[PDB]
Structure formats: structure tokens, C-alpha cells
Design a protein around this ligand. Structure first.
Ligand SMILES: [Mg+2]
Ligand SMILES: [Mg+2]
Ligand SMILES: [Mg+2]
Ligand SMILES: [Mg+2]
Ligand SMILES: [Mg+2]
Ligand SMILES: [Mg+2]
Ligand SMILES: [Mg+2]
Ligand SMILES: [Mg+2]
Ligand SMILES: [Mg+2]
Ligand SMILES: [Mg+2]
Ligand SMILES: [Mg+2]
Ligand SMILES: [Mg+2]
Ligand SMILES: [Mg+2]
Ligand SMILES: [Mg+2]
Ligand SMILES: [Mg+2]
Ligand SMILES: [Mg+2]
Ligand SMILES: [Mg+2]
Ligand SMILES: [Mg+2]
Ligand SMILES: [Mg+2]
Ligand SMILES: [Mg+2]
Ligand SMILES: [Mg+2]
Ligand SMILES: [Mg+2]
Ligand SMILES: [Mg+2]
Ligand SMILES: [Mg+2]
Ligand SMILES: [Mg+2]
Ligand SMILES: [Mg+2]
Ligand SMILES: [Mg+2]
Ligand SMILES: [Mg+2]
Lengths: 83, 138, 99, 124, 104, 208
RNA sequence: AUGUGGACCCGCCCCUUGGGGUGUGUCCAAAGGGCUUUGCCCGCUUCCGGAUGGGCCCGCGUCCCAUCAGCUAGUUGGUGGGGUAAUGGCCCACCAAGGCGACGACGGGUAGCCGGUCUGAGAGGAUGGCCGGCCACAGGGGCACUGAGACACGGGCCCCACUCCUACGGGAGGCAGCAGUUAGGAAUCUUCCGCAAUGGGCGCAAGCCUGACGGAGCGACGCCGCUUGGAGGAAGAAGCCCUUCGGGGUGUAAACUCCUGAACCCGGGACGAAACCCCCGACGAGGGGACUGACGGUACCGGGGUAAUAGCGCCGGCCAACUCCGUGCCAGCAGCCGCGGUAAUACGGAGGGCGCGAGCGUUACCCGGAUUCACUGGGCGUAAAGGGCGUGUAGGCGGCCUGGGGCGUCCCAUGUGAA
């Protein structure tokens, strides 16, 4: 199906992910559908998580499924405003 | 036949100036006329006029030259150092306004024909059109 | 050796045999209807075509035909059947046909 | 040519003709040394030049120059070939790598030592 | 937008099909001279209605046979065998060009 | 690399007085002082009119050997000031003078650029409180260049920063002799430098 | 059986290629499991819609040879049928006699294409290796099965070649998956660690699988950063330089003038990891310490502390850098011009010098310079180059004036030009 995961784009020992809409069958680092955020897991930058929250709602509305870790960051930006 | 009227005129001029003639006759065309309008207004000749030669229409073209210089070879400096037909039959040349050449860093002109009419480059860059590049005349 | 997913091959056979019968049923039932229609036996001929359209859709319930592979086989069938009954026939039972 | 002619025919480009058929265009070829002859140079020079017919693993049969002083190149010694026309011998367009396999490198040189493949003098 | 082309019927010897000669002028990449060029299309004529000679519009269609993916849209101007002739003559010069002579 | 050999033999080859011995090329013995002919068993014979190449060359080894930099770093620098906006000539010198090994020499912490290099390499110098041990680190404007808390009491610093009392620094540095912390105010301009070097050649040399 | 609905044949209307509505007739549905058990969870059937992925069709672009000029029989079209998810000569019977080609068909040679890469002032030239996209293959040839999807690399059948087992009848195989061996070759790595991170399959979940992956290993192969810090004389058992066993330079350059402190030693020691899950709220509530680190005790931080690797090419001109000796068209150098024949800055050593420096040189190949295939940008009286001359086909090119169209040309807006 279509998913929302992380595609690793850093350097050796330097990870930087790209929250991405993509067909699961596709390579991890190959041609995705749309970028909807980035994640720096080491918080070396004061802005280490961005999310186009408007857009996430669009892909979650046509049935994108996130991974456990992608779901984390979506909640942190408050994609699903559980309130 | 004649295969190129504009080139022909541009040459007749170039030839006649090298021998410092007064005027020079070129057979008449609404198009050629529209070009000499530019050559006058940009200051390369004194002007043209529709004289009729053997009951057939021509265009006397009165040429300008610099002042009588000194030393050996007193002949004056040309006002027209250079004049060259660019788009020719079987080799049509078109520029969009982004691609119009600045001739000689602007010390000379490039006549070109557009859907707005026959203009210089500075003129056609003003109105934002391009077209058939007709010649340089620095 | 012996990847235990040659069990997949054991099943392909079991399936292949299941499909292959349903096809032959449709095939020898569809000829029977055409051949009953090329004789004016209109009552018997629709009694059998009606049965054949049924096995057609049934066989399209599982993976054997699915899709418009079935639709097509029904289109080709009722079209052939009606024409032949139109060489002098009058659809008596007129089961699966609408006129 | 007219413009219509450039359109019809056109320009034609230039082929590289390699002055070294070290077959696969490799940078070196191994070869088994056959004749270890001696050739007299041409036009304006005189000497006894040391050449070697070499049987290539590329199936080739080419002659190559033995640079340096003396060699040790027997009827069946094995050797490595590189590029290098020798202006003075015609037909000779390769060199031998002194210091590899049977072609022991020149001895006692103190200057251009990475050519001629002489190790560091133990002068330390 | 299904591509649409304008061209000349040059063949009617087929059943329900016409050959159309679509010309296309365009400037040359390196030398910039404007060059004519042409290509033939087999086009669907459902009623053997378009006769040899006229100019038609060709429209991109669902495939109909091998090498035949256009139907004839509408006639533009009727007969003009000057173009067929130009084409018929071009074809006949091949009569030479071989191992001997031919018709010039 | 870094060259690192006999220096006051280059004072002589370029023929222009050079300060590689930092303290010593001032007193009457930079070797230049009363021996200005080039080295070798040939430094006294007469020089033939050099080819335009040699001129361009010598003008480049001059500039490079002033800053004690490997040709690898140098060309990589010039090619950056070529790509950079503005006059390709002077931008170069501003980059060379933005090198932290040089800034530490310009701020009078060591006497030569050489000794200055070794003070960076040994982490005696801080930029903006943090230690830095890279002679090629590029100081930016607004970067205060201090001296290591550990090394404040060290012999060579006490001596070398003392003689800085009274002296003036460039109109693009601002040192404070008290806390031993200068600051990089501004990228130096061509007239700010007294380099006996014609960069116009150095440019031309690489345009070959 | 049930008919929410959908499929088929005739129709009816809208639409216009097989799009949507509609009537008669016919035909078609289903699966159970778990429970903190009668209501929750994960499933199941038919239909519409979305999203993702893909099939097919068309315009245009896409190397060399004309010492390959004619090519074509399912070949081109038609009706009808077969096949398919679907168009189609994809396939089949019957009919017509067509189709393609100098704007290069047919043939041969070569080659995965591209985003890009290298070069060039640019136009252009060269290329397609890592990374990303598409295609094709999985010892060679062919074929179908299963299925949403395959003509299926670690699935099936047959034939061919190779290897292995063989009781001689018959059987087993397929690293162009990670590693590794072997052969060939100028030349190309560890049978390593790990499921911690990201991603995939399955599972309600706990989890399981994952040589995808994240890491470490080897190799100056590449790029980048960095160290070797520097103040002093000169007796040849065959081995310290420069006018004959003779005239200065090396050279501020040292085996030791102080300073700092690579290696090394001692102690602290990480980011990468918060989710899945448990717990309150409704089985996603700002509580989970529930737990998780291969790299690795490494990066990094603090203390102790030693003066501590330099090599390679070149020095006739192009081309930065010169002298002494040996050698005498010999030994040899050489990219091109060239040097060696007794006085050699060219060979071989030496001293000195120039260039670069953990690298420096050689060879190979590409672009450059080369305006030397010239569009930008070349030529043809004698330097290479006007056809022996004509006639004329196709093609290219086309005097003055007016009017219509807007194909070329120009302008604005817009979609696309992924990473
Ligand atoms: Mg199973
Ligand atoms: Mg039923
Ligand atoms: Mg190939
Ligand atoms: Mg194999
Ligand atoms: Mg399935
Ligand atoms: Mg199937
Ligand atoms: Mg498989
Ligand atoms: Mg395998
Ligand atoms: Mg071998
Ligand atoms: Mg996982
Ligand atoms: Mg790996
Ligand atoms: Mg944490
Ligand atoms: Mg939480
Ligand atoms: Mg010189
Ligand atoms: Mg030499
Ligand atoms: Mg001599
Ligand atoms: Mg010499
Ligand atoms: Mg380095
Ligand atoms: Mg060129
Ligand atoms: Mg060029
Ligand atoms: Mg030209
Ligand atoms: Mg020429
Ligand atoms: Mg001649
Ligand atoms: Mg003649
Ligand atoms: Mg005209
Ligand atoms: Mg238009
Ligand atoms: Mg746009
Ligand atoms: Mg892009």
C-alpha cells in the first residue's frame, strides 16, 4: 500500500531522515511520492523536526499508513490533534 | 535574378561609401524604405528620397563621412565602418527578445524586423519583442 | 535444500485442476447451447444456455475467470444464441433472454 | 559548403588511431621474451640498441626496447611492456619495465631511479 | 489533447483506408535553416468517402490495425493533385538510382 | 609538508626581505642583511632577463612562501576567489589573511607565522571561547581570538604578548593586551596589506 | 436461499468510439476466530468512490557504413471470429492487392537508455562508473501453471552444454544474493559484527525472518584536514663539493641554545532511543523509569609526557633550475626539435639548484589547445580541393504592389522540467 516513512539521507555516523509518502514496495531511498518533513534524530539543530501538517492530513485521508517511528514525529507536530 | 534585395542594398551602400560617392541609387521597396528610416534616425546616412530612374522607382541615399583627416591618405573616416546582412535566404535567423545581441557594446546598432515593425535593438528591447535579425551596422 | 515453500507448488496443482474443470464445463455447455440453437429447439436451448451463464458467473466468483472474462463469455454466448433462434424460432421459454 | 549542403551531407569527425595496440588498451601487457636481438639505429645516429621480440598474452608478436644499461633477458625470460615509441628504431613502439619479473631493474643507478626500477640505496 | 495533423491524401487503393502525407517544417538544430520533412499516415476512412487528392485533418485514435492509429476528422479543401503529382513524381525518380537508369 | 626547512634561504631567492625567522629576520642577520645574492654556487653570477613565466612564477612563490602554505591549499584557494564575486585579485588576499594561523601571527601572539602555526596545532589558541587546533580554520568577522586559559601563564606567551605593548595592529584587527583577546573586525582590503607582491601576476599565472 | 447492489442479451433516452442513466427477462454473494464473553476485537461478501502501482497507443528526439539500394507474403488493408483486463495481422478462416524506401527503407557493424559525469569562453566534443529512474537478463533455448500481479534469479515442465552421484535402470545441480575459492588478467577487499537505528514480509499482539540495511575490516585508489618542530664543522683500506691534490658554496643549515609536546600512559565517557508495549483517559491522552547501542570503551573532554618519518621527478629549447669529473657516433638519452665523433650544462656519477611533498614520476584513455570537419569559425588561379562540357528530374533558393489566413517567427499567461 502507500506508506509514510523515513528515508535516510545523512552521512556515515550522521543521520538525517526525510518523512516521505511512498509506495511500500519501493526501495527505502528511492523515488518517493512527496516529501512532507525532515527529522534530525540528534537534535543538533534547534529546528530538528519539521512537518507539513496540512499535507500529512491529506495522505492520511487517502490511506497512507505510517511506520511506528513516522507516527511518533507526526504526533509531535500534532498531526492528529488528539484534542 | 536578384536573390536578395536587402543584402543587395546593404552592399550597394557599403560599396558606394568606400569610394565616397555623394548619393547612391537602390531600387525601391516599402521594406528597404522602412530600413533606411532607421539608418537616418540612427545617424548613418543623411537620408533617402524616392527619385525615379528611367521611369522606374529608386531611392537616392545620401551618405555621410567624417572629416578630411591629415597625413598621408587624407581620406575621411567612414561613418559606416561595418554593415553585414545576418538572416539571409536559406539561413533565416530569428531571435527572441532574450537573445537580441548588443552590437559593439552599443556603439552600433542591429536592425531587426518584428510583428511591431522594423526597429533597432535598443528599440525592440524597449517594447519587448524579437524577430528576424536583419543586420549589424556598427 | 528443500525450501518448504514448494508447498506453493503443491497448491498450484490442486488449484490448476479445480479451474481446468470449470472451464471445460463452460466450454462443453456453451457449444451444447449454440448447437441446440442451430436447430430451433428453443425451449431446450435456453434451458441450457441459462444453466451455462450460471456456471459462468459461478466460475468467476473464485480466481478461475473473474473480471469481464466472464462478461465477455456471456456476451459472446447470448449474442450467438439469439441470432440462431432468429433463423425461425420464437424464444419459447425465453429464460435468460429479454425481448 | 553552402548551408543547404551542410544540411544534406554534413561534417565528418576524426578517428583516434592508437599508436599502441597493447590490445585491450590496458596500460601494461605481460609477454614472454623470445629473441633478445640488437639493432642499429637510423637517420643520424649509431649504436647497438637492445631490443626484444615479445610474445604477448594479447596473442601479439611485437618488439620492445630494453631501457637502461645491461639487462638479463634470456631466450625465455618474462617481461612487462608499457608505451613508448623509440624515435631511433622503427617498428619499436613499446618499452620494457625495468624492475618487474625476470627483467631485473638496472643496478647501481643513483639518479632517475623510479624509472629503471632501482630500489633505494641502503646509504642510510 | 489527441494530436491533430493536416495532410494530403496520396493513396486510395485500400479498403476503408487512405494514406495521408503530413508535411512538417522546422528549423535545423545546428545550422538553423528551416527544413521541410514529411511522413505518411494510414488513416481510417469508414465509408471510402475521402477520394485521392484532397486535404484532410488527421486525428489520433484508438488503434485500428497494425500501423494505423488515426481517423479522418474533416476535409479542408477538395482536390489538388499538384501535391500528389509532386509526390507521385518523387516516387518515380527511384526508377533510376538503382544499378541502371530510369525516369527523371 | 608545510615546507619546514632552511627559511632564510628563501629570503634570498625571491630577493625581497621576508619574515620567516620572525624574530631574527629583524636584527642584522636575516641572511638578507649583507648577503642578498641567491643561494647555491651560482647566486653571484649575472641573471639573464627572465621569461614572463619565471616572473609570474617568482611572484607566486613569493606570495605563497610568505604564508607558508602547501600548493594544494593555495590553488584550491585561488580557484575559490575566481568563482567568488568581486575582484578576483584582492578577495584572495582576504582569504589568506582570514587564516587563523595568520590572524594569530597578525595579532602579535607569535613572532613568525611558523611559530604561530605551532601554537594553533597545539591548542594554545581559542576562537570564541572554544579551542581550535587547525591552522587553516577561517576566521570570520566578529570572531574574538583569545589565548588558552591553561597557557596564559606559559613562558613564550608572557614574553611575546608583552612586546605587543605599545605597538599598533591592523585597521581590521583589534587586540586587547590585558586579557590577551584580539578580535577580527573586518576582512582586510588590498591597501591594508604591505605585501611586496603583485597579485596581478599571481592571477595571470593560473590563467595559463 | 437472501438482491443493498452488480454482470449479460434486447432495448428508450442522454451522451458521442466500448461514457452515464433506464425497463422486461436471466444470472451472481458470504467465514469464521478471539475475548478483560451477548458486545467488543481482528477478519469475511457484493457495490461505488479515492489513493498507489501498472498495461497498451501516439508526436518528437536517440551512434557508424551507400565498398548494404531496393525491401515486403501475415506482407498492407477489409469483413468475420479467436485471444486478452483492454486496442490491435496479437492469432485464425475468407476477401482485396496492398505496404516501405534516397527525408536512407532492406542489410551489416556497434551499444542497455537517461537524470548526469569530464572537458570547453562558448557553441560543441567525450562519456553513462558510484547515486537515482526506467528497460533486459538469472548456465544457453523454449513453455505454461498458480495468482491482484510472473512466463517467475534462491518455483514447475521439456530440450542443449558443463559438473557431481550412480547398484548403469536412473537421479542431483545453477553465487550476475553476502562473504569466499579458482581461472583468466597490468589490476580490484573480510568465509568479520549486529537487529541497536531505518525499511520490508507475516502476525490482534508478544514476536519472528531480513548478508535490505546500519557498522567495523583491507588497499595513499580518491578527496579533505594534520605531524616530522630547529640558532653552530667538515682526517678518502675500493666512498666531502667549486681554476692541476684547486677557487667558494651547501648555510643559519646541525649529533644537542632554550620553549612547546605527534606517538605513548592514566581516568571520565556519549549523542544516535522513543516508539512498538504496560499503565489513566474510549485499546492513538502529553503518565510509558517498565525495555532496549552492533559501532565501543570508539568519538569527545580532563591530567601525564618524548625533539619526534622524507621522498619523488627535473635542471639544452619549449620549461622554473649549472657546474666539476668520467665517457668519446661507444655505453646510453629522447614527448617533438635533437645530444654523444676529446674539451658534453642533453649520456653515467658528483656538488649545487628548480618543482611538488606522504607522495612524486611512468604508461593508458577522454576533452582541450585544434579557427585541424570551421553553426559560432576554414577553404578550392599556383599550397589539398571546380566535376571534361552540357541538358535537365527531385530538391534548395525567388522582383514590385494590395488584401485575407496566422504554418514558420515573436510576446504574455499557464502546466511540466522528480530526487
Ligand atoms: Mg504456507
Ligand atoms: Mg445463488
Ligand atoms: Mg553489449
Ligand atoms: Mg554464470
Ligand atoms: Mg494473491
Ligand atoms: Mg489465472
Ligand atoms: Mg519465485
Ligand atoms: Mg542463487
Ligand atoms: Mg594469473
Ligand atoms: Mg523494523
Ligand atoms: Mg553493508
Ligand atoms: Mg535521550
Ligand atoms: Mg507519550
Ligand atoms: Mg630556463
Ligand atoms: Mg634524463
Ligand atoms: Mg669533457
Ligand atoms: Mg649534465
Ligand atoms: Mg594530503
Ligand atoms: Mg574543434
Ligand atoms: Mg573548439
Ligand atoms: Mg563556416
Ligand atoms: Mg584550411
Ligand atoms: Mg593543386
Ligand atoms: Mg572547368
Ligand atoms: Mg518574396
Ligand atoms: Mg502561429
Ligand atoms: Mg513555464
Ligand atoms: Mg532537479
Amino acid at each position: 500500500m502507500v506508506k509514510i516513512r523515513l528515508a535516510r539521507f545523512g552521512s556515515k555516523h550522521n543521520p538525517h531522515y526525510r518523512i516521505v509518502v511512498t509506495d511500500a514496495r519501493r526501495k527505502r531511498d528511492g523515488k518517493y511520492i512527496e516529501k512532507i518533513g525532515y527529522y534530525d534524530p540528534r537534535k543538533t539543530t534547534p529546528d530538528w523536526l519539521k512537518v507539513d501538517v496540512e499535507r500529512a492530513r491529506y495522505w492520511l485521508s487517502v490511506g497512507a499508513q505510517p511506520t511506528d517511528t513516522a507516527r511518533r514525529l507526526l504526533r509531535q507536530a500534532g498531526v492528529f490533534r488528539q484534542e | 535574378m536578384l536573390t536578395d534585395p536587402i543584402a543587395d542594398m546593404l552592399t550597394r551602400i557599403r560599396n558606394a561609401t568606400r569610394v565616397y560617392k555623394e548619393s547612391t541609387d537602390v531600387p525601391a521597396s516599402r521594406f528597404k524604405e522602412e530600413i533606411l528610416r532607421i539608418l537616418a534616425r540612427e545617424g548613418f546616412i543623411k537620408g533617402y528620397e524616392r527619385v525615379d530612374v528611367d521611369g522606374k522607382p529608386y531611392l537616392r541615399v545620401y551618405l555621410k563621412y567624417g572629416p578630411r583627416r591629415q597625413g598621408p591618405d587624407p581620406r575621411p573616416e567612414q561613418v559606416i565602418h561595418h554593415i553585414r546582412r545576418i538572416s539571409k535566404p536559406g539561413r533565416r535567423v530569428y531571435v527572441g527578445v532574450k537573445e537580441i545581441p548588443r552590437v559593439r557594446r552599443g556603439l552600433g546598432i542591429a536592425i531587426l524586423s518584428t510583428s511591431k515593425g522594423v526597429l533597432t535593438d535598443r528599440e525592440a528591447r524597449k517594447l519587448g519583442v524579437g524577430g528576424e535579425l536583419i543586420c549589424e551596422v556598427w | 535444500r528443500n525450501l518448504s515453500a514448494l508447498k506453493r507448488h503443491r497448491q498450484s496443482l490442486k488449484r490448476r485442476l479445480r479451474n481446468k474443470a470449470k472451464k471445460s464445463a463452460i466450454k462443453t455447455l456453451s457449444k451444447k447451447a449454440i448447437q441446440l440453437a442451430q436447430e430451433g429447439k428453443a425451449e431446450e436451448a435456453l434451458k441450457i444456455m441459462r444453466k451455462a451463464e450460471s456456471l459462468i458467473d459461478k466460475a468467476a466468483k473464485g480466481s478461475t475467470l473473474h473480471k469481464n472474462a466472464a462478461a465477455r463469455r456471456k456476451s459472446r454466448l447470448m449474442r450467438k444464441v439469439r441470432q440462431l433462434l432468429e433463423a425461425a424460432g420464437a424464444p419459447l421459454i425465453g429464460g435468460g433472454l429479454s425481448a | 559548403p553552402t548551408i543547404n549542403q551542410l544540411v544534406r551531407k554534413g561534417r565528418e569527425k576524426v578517428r583516434k588511431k592508437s599508436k599502441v595496440p597493447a590490445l585491450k588498451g590496458a596500460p601494461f601487457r605481460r609477454g614472454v621474451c623470445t629473441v633478445v636481438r640488437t639493432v642499429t639505429p637510423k637517420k643520424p645516429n649509431s649504436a647497438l640498441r637492445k631490443v626484444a621480440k615479445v610474445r604477448l598474452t594479447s596473442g601479439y608478436e611485437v618488439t620492445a626496447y630494453i631501457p637502461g644499461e645491461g639487462h638479463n633477458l634470456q631466450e625465455h625470460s618474462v617481461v612487462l611492456i608499457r608505451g613508448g615509441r623509440v624515435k631511433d628504431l622503427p617498428g619499436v613502439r613499446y618499452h620494457i619495465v625495468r624492475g618487474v619479473y625476470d627483467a631485473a631493474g638496472v643496478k647501481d643507478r643513483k639518479k632517475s631511479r623510479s624509472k629503471y626500477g632501482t630500489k633505494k640505496p641502503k646509504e642510510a | 489533447p489527441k494530436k491533430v495533423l493536416t495532410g494530403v491524401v496520396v493513396s486510395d487503393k485500400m479498403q476503408k483506408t487512405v494514406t495521408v502525407l503530413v508535411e512538417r517544417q522546422f528549423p535545423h538544430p545546428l545550422y538553423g535553416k528551416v527544413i521541410k520533412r514529411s511522413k505518411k499516415y494510414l488513416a481510417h476512412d469508414p465509408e471510402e468517402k475521402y477520394k485521392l487528392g484532397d486535404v484532410v485533418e488527421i486525428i489520433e485514435s484508438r488503434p485500428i490495425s497494425k500501423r494505423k492509429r488515426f481517423r479522418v476528422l474533416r476535409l479542408v479543401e477538395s482536390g489538388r493533385m499538384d501535391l500528389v503529382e509532386k509526390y507521385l513524381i518523387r516516387r518515380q525518380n527511384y526508377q533510376s538510382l538503382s544499378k541502371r537508369g530510369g525516369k527523371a | 609538508g608545510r615546507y619546514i626547512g632552511p627559511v632564510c634561504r628563501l629570503c634570498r631567492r625571491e630577493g625581497v626581505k621576508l619574515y620567516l625567522k620572525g624574530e631574527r629576520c629583524y636584527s642584522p642577520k636575516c641572511a638578507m642583511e649583507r648577503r642578498p645574492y641567491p643561494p647555491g654556487q651560482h647566486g653571484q653570477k649575472r641573471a639573464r632577463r627572465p621569461s614572463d613565466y619565471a616572473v609570474r612564477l617568482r611572484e607566486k612563490q613569493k606570495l605563497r612562501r610568505i604564508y607558508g602554505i602547501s600548493e594544494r591549499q593555495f590553488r584550491n584557494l585561488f580557484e575559490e576567489a575566481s568563482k567568488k564575486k568581486g575582484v578576483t585579485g584582492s578577495v584572495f588576499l582576504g582569504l589568506l589573511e582570514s587564516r587563523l594561523d595568520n590572524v594569530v601571527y597578525r595579532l602579535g601572539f607569535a613572532v613568525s607565522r611558523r611559530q604561530a602555526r605551532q601554537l594553533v596545532r597545539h591548542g594554545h589558541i581559542t576562537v570564541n571561547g572554544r579551542r581550535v587546533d587547525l591552522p587553516s580554520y577561517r576566521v570570520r568577522p566578529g570572531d574574538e581570538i583569545a589565548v588558552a586559559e591553561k597557557s596564559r601563564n606559559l613562558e613564550l606567551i608572557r614574553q611575546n604578548l608583552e612586546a605587543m605593548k605599545g605597538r599598533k595592529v591592523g585597521p581590521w584587527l583589534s587586540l586587547d593586551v590585558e586579557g590577551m583577546k584580539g578580535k577580527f573586525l573586518r576582512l582586510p582590503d588590498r591597501e591594508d596589506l604591505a605585501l611586496p607582491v603583485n597579485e596581478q601576476l599571481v592571477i595571470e599565472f593560473y590563467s595559463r
